[PDB]
Design a protein around this ligand. Sequence first.
Ligand SMILES: [Ca+2]
Ligand SMILES: [Zn+2]
Lengths: 343, 80, 320
Amino acid sequence: MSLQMVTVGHNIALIQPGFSLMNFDGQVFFFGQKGWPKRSCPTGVFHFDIKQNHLKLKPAIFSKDSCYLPPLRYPATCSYKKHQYIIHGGKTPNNELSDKIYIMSVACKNNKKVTFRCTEKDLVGDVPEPRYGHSIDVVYSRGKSMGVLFGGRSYMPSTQRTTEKWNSVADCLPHVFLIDFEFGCATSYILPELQDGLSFHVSIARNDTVYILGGHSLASNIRPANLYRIRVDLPLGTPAVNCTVLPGGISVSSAILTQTNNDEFVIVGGYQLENQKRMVCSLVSLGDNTIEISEMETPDWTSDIKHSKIWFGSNMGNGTIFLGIPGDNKQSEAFYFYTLRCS
Amino acid sequence: AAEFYKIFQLEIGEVYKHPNASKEERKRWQATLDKHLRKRMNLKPIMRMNGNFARKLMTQETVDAVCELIPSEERHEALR
Amino acid sequence: YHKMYRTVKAITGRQIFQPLHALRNAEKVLLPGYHPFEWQPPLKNVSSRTDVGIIDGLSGLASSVDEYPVDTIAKRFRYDSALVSALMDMEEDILEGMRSQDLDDYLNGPFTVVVKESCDGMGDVSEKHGSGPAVPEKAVRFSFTVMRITIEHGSQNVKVFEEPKPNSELCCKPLCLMLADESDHETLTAILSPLIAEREAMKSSELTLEMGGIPRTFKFIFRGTGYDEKLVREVEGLEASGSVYICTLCDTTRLEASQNLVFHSITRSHAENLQRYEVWRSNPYHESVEELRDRVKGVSAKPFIETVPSIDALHCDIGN
Ligand SMILES: [Ca+2]
Ligand SMILES: [Zn+2]
């Protein structure tokens, strides 16, 4: 529950709400900047390093064969098992959506420098539509690892779009998609147990299930206190997907996930209502087939957090969460960044 | 009105219990006071203060909005 | 005006000036969204209503707490409605121009209209107090001007109306006013993309309008010349500030620009910029950062406005 203020270098005008933080072998990096890539960092990734509560952003060069990807403003985070990192879709800085897939990897690493390898893949079959705010995660069933996708928010189809409502968004179809990374395949699956959409939710991994809890549905302008547990197996034939509604779910959207200990994750932040903020923390203790959400003591927030309207952040991976508060008007430096420690 | 604005800045941090403060803490106090003033009474932060700012800041809603950021109640009643 | 009207009426006894509500009623004839117009073929993704007026420039952008925060105020007209009103404001002018060239009056040939697109941001605009988001103290304006109107007569093309003073304040008709910052790219694209969509739809269609008792059809060609160098670079590609690549019309680097500077050719366009951005994003030849930049010739972003490769004389004089 440690709350430490962090200072930032000469790149504070380069972090925007909706970023993503990736942890590679104990090193935390950055993605999803504000504005198009400059001449200082043509790639777009950064060396997210905090020492003595001071933040410095050094550029990180890609490999020779990597693809220079645009800054996704709201991607989907995945951590495949060789240790790679997968992002799907999101908003480009020009505010168009993408239906493309990228996989992060380290091509080569030397003294105090790192080179990435981002690959390009095309999905065939039931290709999901471009969207943002969704959640992706992978499961390990019967010795086979295969990722699952859930709906989010997307623009109106290319048939009902008008310029006067060009930027109006509608929640994606309740369909649940299965992603096979090693082959680039996807077969759609419609499940009657999921009737409404769900956006800005958190995804928790396990051996053969994903626990989606909380989230915002735009159609009814409500945040359900629901909790779905999706169990997927990998037989010889077509995969079988089962969704079961569980009791005890919480009603939070755009929360932050962290992995503090094995079989122990903590939820902090988010919004309960449009004008309300998540002031409490939920400790989710996983098990073989059991989930028990309990309320742990509220960390000591500051006045700036308790009185602000917005916060945003991503996952450090090492039991740390990096959340920021809008500093002030542009006219300190337009953003106040904090760090949070969970045991 | 400028003097009352400075009083509010030093009161939203309880300097009567912290006689020593750094520049960064006072800048944070400035930022949070400006943010809450905008949120509640719809006043923008300005570098040279006008008379309209004085007339609007000299209201009871001003001390209400400033005081709900002050953890103590003695400061609340004193400012009121 | 009300004070003037009241005092003139009180002194003279008669009603020389008209009342404010009469002026407001007479106002609607000129504002967009009063005349009936039909598109053939119908515009893609553009509604066919003929009663659209001052619509929000945010284009129905999300403003909830769970998504990207928006802190801008924008009001804009539909491009087609604005051009309909602009054409009807010069109805008698077009008739006079057609008469003066010894053509007919009820001729309904397809008019080839060229419209210059101008957009420039501003600074030092004070923010008001009052309800609204934390809107920054900068403004960006989008406006269009009507240079020339030509009708097809015989085998050649004849001219009708030419703007006598193109650089005047009496012909820069506003189209979209947003009080945001041109340095920001996300908000600029979010507010300005629908107008580009309408422009692209209008680029491949024809408009029918009851022009002075006889229906006549219009075709439109657009030129985005009214941009300064910084906005051109920030919109259609190349990096800001001063790079190794300089010109917006050719692939000349700074060193050979200093060397030769007499022999060149215009090469850049918008389709070429899009193709080069695709090359940059995909890297088909598996090249490192420096050689990939040399291959892509400086573009490292997705362009979204077709800007004509021209030069701005005012800023040219200022810089020179
Ligand atoms: Ca200017
Ligand atoms: Zn040139």
